[PDB]
Ligand binder design. Structure first.
Ligand SMILES: [Zn+2]
Ligand SMILES: [Zn+2]
Lengths: 52, 52
């Protein structure tokens, strides 16, 4: 069962919160949240272009 | 070494392309791309709110 899930994480560069939605099984969401702890950061729309 | 990486994937709901940037080590990016094959989909801004 894939389910919709709201990901919330601080931008790599500016620590603004970045919100994105994914559709994923339980284990993928658990995996993603584990990645977000240390190994992966998401980037906000402005920093994704460069200027904060 | 974390590096910036442009993720491109089709929206779960509408198959519009969704682009996001992450900062991640090699193995995390490999892991993410593996997830995107089957177990995880990202969702575009409009579908993230509901109306396509
Ligand atoms: Zn930012
Ligand atoms: Zn969409």
């Amino acid at each position: 069962m894939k389910q919709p899930y709201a990901v919330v994480a601080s931008c790599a560069y500016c620590e603004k919160l970045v919100r994105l939605t994914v559709l994923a099984d339980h284990s993928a969401i658990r995996q993603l949240e584990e990645m977000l702890l240390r190994s992966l950061n998401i980037v906000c729309p402005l920093c994704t272009l460069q200027r904060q």
